[PDB]
Design an enzyme around this catalytic site. Structure first.
Site, mmCIF file in Angstrom:
data_model
loop_
_atom_site.group_PDB
_atom_site.id
_atom_site.type_symbol
_atom_site.label_atom_id
_atom_site.label_comp_id
_atom_site.label_asym_id
_atom_site.label_seq_id
_atom_site.Cartn_x
_atom_site.Cartn_y
_atom_site.Cartn_z
ATOM 1 N N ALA A 43 1.010 -1.444 -0.060
ATOM 2 C CA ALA A 43 -0.055 -0.086 -0.132
ATOM 3 C C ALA A 43 0.801 1.297 -0.067
ATOM 4 C CB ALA A 43 -1.067 0.129 1.224
ATOM 5 N N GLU B 258 9.370 4.180 7.611
ATOM 6 C CA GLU B 258 8.895 2.746 8.050
ATOM 7 C C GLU B 258 9.627 2.380 9.440
ATOM 8 O OE1 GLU B 258 7.670 -0.242 6.782
ATOM 9 O OE2 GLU B 258 8.303 -0.748 8.751
ATOM 10 N N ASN C 226 4.254 -7.053 5.984
ATOM 11 C CA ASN C 226 3.563 -8.343 5.390
ATOM 12 C C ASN C 226 3.516 -8.718 4.114
ATOM 13 O OD1 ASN C 226 1.654 -10.634 6.512
ATOM 14 N ND2 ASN C 226 0.160 -9.649 4.957
ATOM 15 N N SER C 227 3.472 -7.713 3.109
ATOM 16 C CA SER C 227 3.703 -7.591 1.904
ATOM 17 C C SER C 227 4.651 -8.387 1.223
ATOM 18 C CB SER C 227 3.400 -6.339 1.173
ATOM 19 O OG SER C 227 2.190 -5.838 1.478
ATOM 20 N N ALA D 208 1.541 -13.437 -2.010
ATOM 21 C CA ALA D 208 1.648 -12.175 -3.063
ATOM 22 C C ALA D 208 1.000 -12.232 -4.278
ATOM 23 C CB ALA D 208 2.949 -11.538 -3.260
ATOM 24 N N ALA E 61 6.366 6.291 13.302
ATOM 25 C CA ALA E 61 5.191 7.189 13.199
ATOM 26 C C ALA E 61 4.571 7.068 14.756
ATOM 27 C CB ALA E 61 4.280 7.313 12.295
ATOM 28 N N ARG F 133 -11.431 -19.693 4.586
ATOM 29 C CA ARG F 133 -10.368 -19.849 5.514
ATOM 30 C C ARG F 133 -10.839 -19.959 6.832
ATOM 31 N NH1 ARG F 133 -6.006 -15.246 4.371
ATOM 32 N NH2 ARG F 133 -5.045 -16.105 2.442
HETATM 33 N N1 LIG Z 1 4.092 3.261 13.821
HETATM 34 C C1 LIG Z 1 4.676 3.006 12.345
HETATM 35 N N2 LIG Z 1 5.350 3.725 11.693
HETATM 36 C C2 LIG Z 1 6.113 3.555 10.545
HETATM 37 N N3 LIG Z 1 5.917 2.331 9.860
HETATM 38 C C3 LIG Z 1 4.913 1.430 10.712
HETATM 39 C C4 LIG Z 1 4.238 1.793 11.761
HETATM 40 N N4 LIG Z 1 3.597 0.620 11.951
HETATM 41 C C5 LIG Z 1 3.592 -0.090 10.994
HETATM 42 N N5 LIG Z 1 4.752 0.454 9.902
HETATM 43 C C6 LIG Z 1 5.081 -0.411 8.854
HETATM 44 O O1 LIG Z 1 3.957 -0.335 7.654
HETATM 45 C C7 LIG Z 1 4.317 -1.480 7.012
HETATM 46 C C8 LIG Z 1 2.817 -2.212 6.653
HETATM 47 O O2 LIG Z 1 3.308 -2.926 5.430
HETATM 48 P P1 LIG Z 1 2.211 -4.164 5.350
HETATM 49 O O3 LIG Z 1 2.230 -5.077 6.381
HETATM 50 O O4 LIG Z 1 2.705 -4.815 4.028
HETATM 51 O O5 LIG Z 1 0.646 -3.566 5.181
HETATM 52 P P2 LIG Z 1 -0.174 -3.330 3.648
HETATM 53 O O6 LIG Z 1 -0.152 -4.953 3.102
HETATM 54 O O7 LIG Z 1 -1.306 -2.818 4.001
HETATM 55 O O8 LIG Z 1 0.993 -2.554 2.768
HETATM 56 C C9 LIG Z 1 5.141 -2.482 7.392
HETATM 57 O O9 LIG Z 1 6.388 -2.486 7.021
HETATM 58 C C10 LIG Z 1 5.078 -2.009 9.165
HETATM 59 O O10 LIG Z 1 6.515 -2.151 9.792
HETATM 60 CL CL LIG Z 2 -7.427 -19.684 0.761
HETATM 61 CL CL LIG Z 3 -3.953 -12.975 3.002
#
Ligand SMILES: Nc1ncnc2c1ncn2[C@@H]1O[C@H](COP(=O)(O)OP(=O)(O)O)[C@@H](O)[C@H]1O
Ligand SMILES: [Cl-]
Ligand SMILES: [Cl-]
Ligand SMILES: [Cl-]
Ligand SMILES: [Cl-]
Ligand SMILES: [Cl-]
Length: 459
Positions: A15, A34, A42-43, A48, A157, A283
């Site tokens: 995202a 980040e 998670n991505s 994926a 953040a 699921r």
């Molecule tokens: N407080 C925060 N400040 C900065 N980054 C953050 C914070 N909380 C979570 N994140 C980061 O946001 C990212 C979310 O990515 P992801 O889990 O792939 O979500 P999405 O699938 O919605 O893109 C992670 O790398 C995570 O560490």
């Molecule tokens: Cl599934």
């Molecule tokens: Cl999923």
């Protein structure tokens, strides 16, 4: 220390990368902050695959699909609790999102195969090279560097900065024990992912969840974006809906991607040697069913014929090696050996597989109505894996409109604030379908970057 950018994106998953690239493409300055030392969230660790109705791969394969069917599958799969407009906009933009990953980000998808995840009526999930998010995040990282999008890691953040009119105008973040102020002249995009790794928040919103395992998802997925936004009166919804992935390691609870053979004809066999649930159910349905079987586990059984189509053993050699070393998976020549290695009654397994072979030939699974059709299992070699469900994904989160604008508790837009991806709570209803999180994160991440880029400059 302070920085100023037009668009400040929080999170470096799919995202946040999508939002960042779109902000730069509109000519705006942007940054991704980040929390973790490395990008991807998670991505990165996800399989994926990405659902699209009407893709170039479906055309190559001669598979007919429609936006109507994709919308219906999605909404039904979450008990009609998903927001219909959010689902429609996801599906309407899916082709464009995938073509953008292919042509702009240079993600490589296989041209001639697709996954049919549980709850889907046809094969529709595009498969990135390697069957993980490593390909996607690596390509995003390269493209971000090329276009000049900075990524500040180890930057957490902590607070949204709000002016007297209610507009969000920046973010305070912690880096190396110091507070850094990010001024955001056009918008802040919350792209922080889900909250399944926050064990306290799990407990708060769903006190009856499975507690057999800790988190084996991404350690940054702790709900910080929800917390920060709720402090400035953003609404949240669906927080108690928390999903188990059905096919996880019995020892750790980690998702077993090697068992993606389930989308290609692998069967779920209980300790008695019986099938007990449709392998392409939802699921939640499958997880509940497995937990009701002896020992609260299942086996996943497939053969070389399935591997020759699916390639999940080839693609997940680390899992193969570890599960094999731990006695949780075996490769054997015959069904009798597959039964023996896991103490399954031989006569029962052979009878079940005789039925499967018949159902595969007729296309009619009289036992569980397999929605794609079973596959003959008369020839080995075979793999057999022991698995159990584990908690992995949060369905709830922030309330947004289809423009990704965050809404307050009265349903009013919070100016300057956008949110996209697994932090939002309006797409998946009670139960996410496989492959749909990637469609959501890219579609809405792109929209969030576009919308933040056009939002008026803060004077
Ligand atoms: N407080 C925060 N400040 C900065 N980054 C953050 C914070 N909380 C979570 N994140 C980061 O946001 C990212 C979310 O990515 P992801 O889990 O792939 O979500 P999405 O699938 O919605 O893109 C992670 O790398 C995570 O560490
Ligand atoms: Cl599934
Ligand atoms: Cl999923
Ligand atoms: Cl259509
Ligand atoms: Cl809820
Ligand atoms: Cl692996």
């Amino acid at each position: 220390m302070e920085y100023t950018y037009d668009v400040v994106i929080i999170g470096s998953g799919g995202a946040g990368f999508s939002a960042g690239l779109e902000a730069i493409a509109a000519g705006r300055s942007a940054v991704i902050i980040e929390k973790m030392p490395i990008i991807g969230g998670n991505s990165l660790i996800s399989g994926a695959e990405m659902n699209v109705a009407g893709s170039w791969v479906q055309k190559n394969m001669g598979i007919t699909d429609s936006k109507e069917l994709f919308i219906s599958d999605t909404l039904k799969g979450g008990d009609f609790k998903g927001d219909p407009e959010m689902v429609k906009t996801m599906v309407d933009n899916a082709v464009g999102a995938a073509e953008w990953l292919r042509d702009y980000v240079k993600v490589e998808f296989y041209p001639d195969q697709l996954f049919q995840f549980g709850g889907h009526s046809v094969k529709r999930a595009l498969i990135p090279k390697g069957h993980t998010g490593a390909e996607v995040i690596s390509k995003f990282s390269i493209k971000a560097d090329e276009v000049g999008l900075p990524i500040h890691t180890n930057t957490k953040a902590e607070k949204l900065i709000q002016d007297q009119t209610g507009r969000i105008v920046g973010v305070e973040a912690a880096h190396n024990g110091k507070t850094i102020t990010y001024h955001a002249k056009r918008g802040v995009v919350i792209a922080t992912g889900g909250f399944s790794s926050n064990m306290e928040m799990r407990k708060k919103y769903n006190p009856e969840l499975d507690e057999r395992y800790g988190s084996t998802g991404h350690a940054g997925g702790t709900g910080d974006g929800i917390v920060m936004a709720e402090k400035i009166h953003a609404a949240a919804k669906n927080m108690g809906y928390i999903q188990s992935y059905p096919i996880c390691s019995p020892t750790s609870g980690a998702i077993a991607l090697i068992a993606d053979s389930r989308f290609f004809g692998a069967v779920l066999i209980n300790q008695k040697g019986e099938r007990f649930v449709e392998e392409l159910e939802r699921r939640d349905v499958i997880s509940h069913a497995i937990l009701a079987q002896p020992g609260r586990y299942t086996y996943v059984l497939w053969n070389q014929d399935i591997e020759n189509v699916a390639h999940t053993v080839e693609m997940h050699q680390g899992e193969l090696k570890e599960f094999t070393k731990d006695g949780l998976m075996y490769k054997v020549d015959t069904l009798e050996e597959a039964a023996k290695v896991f103490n399954i009654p031989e006569d029962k397994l052979l009878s079940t597989i005789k039925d499967v072979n018949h159902y595969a030939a007729t296309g009619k699974d009289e036992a569980f109505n397999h929605r794609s059709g079973l596959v003959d299992l008369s020839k080995g070699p075979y793999w057999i894996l022991k698995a159990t469900p584990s908690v992995h994904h949060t369905m709830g989160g922030l309330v947004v409109d289809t423009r990704t604008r965050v809404l307050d508790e009265q349903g009013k837009v919070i100016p300057g604030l956008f949110a996209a991806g697994e932090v939002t709570g309006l797409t998946h209803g009670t139960n996410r379908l496989g492959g749909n999180a990637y469609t959501d994160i890219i579609v809405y991440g792109r929209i969030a970057g576009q919308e933040a880029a056009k939002h008026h400059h803060h004077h």
